[PDB]
Amino acid sequence: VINTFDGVADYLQTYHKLPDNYITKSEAQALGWVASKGNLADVAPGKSIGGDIFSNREGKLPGKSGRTWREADINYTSGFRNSDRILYSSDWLIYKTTDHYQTFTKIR
Ligand SMILES: [Zn+2]
């Protein structure tokens, strides 16, 4: 499983896709994920949520015409989701948050 900041960041910039252990929120819900029960690891063993579009409403991440942002969960194994996320753009800038999207720092 590749689910660390460095592992995922380097996989994205190389393969231009998330590794195989990621599924989107819609895919997890269809499989039986119920957020309030913390059951992802029971219904989709070895999977983490990732690949959804991140709005960037607050404008915290750098914006540019034609740039889209997406997110993925980092460090997840089981239980409720944590506060760690990787943020990646369509042009391969990579940011991290460990505080539920309040602050970001560049890592690639
Ligand atoms: Zn490619």
Explain what this protein looks like in three dimensions.
The chain is α+β, with helices and mostly antiparallel strands and 108 residues long. The chain has a single domain, classed as Microbial ribonucleases (Nuclear Transport Factor 2, Chain: A). Helix content is 20%, strand content 22%. A six-stranded mixed beta sheet has the order 1-2-3-4-5-6. Strand 4 (85-89) and strand 5 (94-97) form a beta hairpin. It is globular. The protein starts with a helix and ends with a strand. The structure holds zinc ion.
Helices and strands in order, then pairings?
Layout lengths: L4 H11 L6 E2 L1 H7 L8 H4 L4 E6 L15 E5 L11 E5 L4 E4 L7 E2 L2
Parallel strand pairs: 1-2
Antiparallel strand pairs: 2-3, 3-4, 4-5, 5-6
The chain binds zinc ion (ZN).
